[PDB]
C-alpha cells in the first residue's frame, strides 16, 4: 500500500561541500540516498514530495570526522507491505519452488505449498509454468496475490504470497 509519510533523516556531508551551495548538495544526497532505498520501518521510499520546501536544521560538526551531520525532514511517498493484504502484480520468475510476483518495487514469493493442489509444475514447456485445467501461470502473466507474511530488515523487505483462497489467482 502507498502512503504519504513524514520522514526524517540524518545526512552527513564531507567537508569538501562547505560552500554557498551546500544546501543544494544536501538535496542531492537526499535524492540519491533516500529515493529507491528500502527501510524496514517505513518500507520502500519512492518519491520525495515538496522538493523546494525541504527543511534542514543547523548542522553539527563531528569531532573526529570533520563532516557535518544534517537532520533533514521531508515528505515522501512510501510503499509498506502488510500481511493479509491483496495486491496485483506480474510474474517475473518461475521455478520448482514457486513463482514470484512483482508488486511495485517488491517481489512476492508464492511457495509450492501455498498454491492450490490443482496447479502443477511443468518445465518441459519453454518457459516453465504452473498449469491447471482452467488457467496457466507463466512469466509476464498477471496474478492477484495475498501477502501471508513479511520479514522487514533494516535495509530490505521480503514477503510470501498465497493464491489458495478463492478470488485469488490469474486476473
Amino acid at each position: 500500500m502507498f502512503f504519504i509519510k513524514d520522514l526524517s533523516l540524518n545526512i552527513t556531508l564531507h567537508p569538501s561541500f562547505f560552500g554557498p551551495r551546500m544546501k543544494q548538495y544536501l538535496k542531492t544526497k537526499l535524492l540519491e540516498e533516500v529515493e529507491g532505498s528500502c527501510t524496514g520501518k517505513f518500507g520502500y521510499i519512492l518519491c520525495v514530495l515538496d522538493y523546494d520546501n525541504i527543511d534542514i536544521q543547523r548542522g553539527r560538526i563531528l569531532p573526529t570526522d570533520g563532516s557535518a551531520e544534517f537532520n533533514v525532514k521531508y515528505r515522501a511517498v512510501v510503499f509498506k507491505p502488510f500481511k493479509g493484504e491483496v495486491v496485483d502484480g506480474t510474474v517475473v520468475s518461475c521455478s520448482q519452488h514457486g513463482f514470484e510476483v512483482q508488486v511495485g518495487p517488491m517481489k512476492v514469493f508464492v511457495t509450492k505449498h501455498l498454491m492450490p493442489q490443482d496447479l502443477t509444475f511443468n518445465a518441459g514447456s519453454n518457459p516453465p509454468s504452473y498449469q491447471s485445467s482452467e488457467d496457466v501461470i507463466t512469466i509476464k502473466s498477471r496474478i492477484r496475490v495475498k501477502i501471508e507474511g513479511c520479514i522487514s530488515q533494516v535495509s530490505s523487505i521480503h514477503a510470501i504470497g498465497s493464491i489458495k483462497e478463492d478470488y485469488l489467482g490469474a486476473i
Partner: protein
C-alpha cells in the same frame, strides 16, 4: 578533550541496551533474539576494555544497558 579520546564497534539493541545484536554484516542483517526486532539497532564505538567490562557485568547478572537517548 579530543586528545584524551584519541576501539571497538559493537551493535546495541534499541529496546535492550545489551550488546546482543547478532549482526550478519555480509547480508546486512541485524537481529536481537529475545527482543524480536531488526529495525532498532545502533552501533557505538567503545573501547574493547569497555566491551569487556560490560560483558563481565553481564556475567555477574548485571544488566548494563547502553542507551543512545536520554529519558
Amino acid at each position: 578533550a579530543s586528545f584524551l579520546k584519541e576501539a571497538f564497534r559493537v551493535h546495541i539493541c534499541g529496546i535492550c541496551g545489551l550488546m546482543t545484536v547478532i549482526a550478519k554484516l555480509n547480508h546486512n542483517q541485524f537481529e536481537c533474539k529475545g527482543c524480536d526486532n531488526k529495525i532498532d539497532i545502533y552501533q557505538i564505538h567503545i573501547p574493547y576494555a569497555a566491551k569487556l567490562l560490560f560483558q563481565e557485568l553481564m556475567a555477574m547478572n548485571i544488566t548494563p544497558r547502553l542507551y543512545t537517548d536520554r529519558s
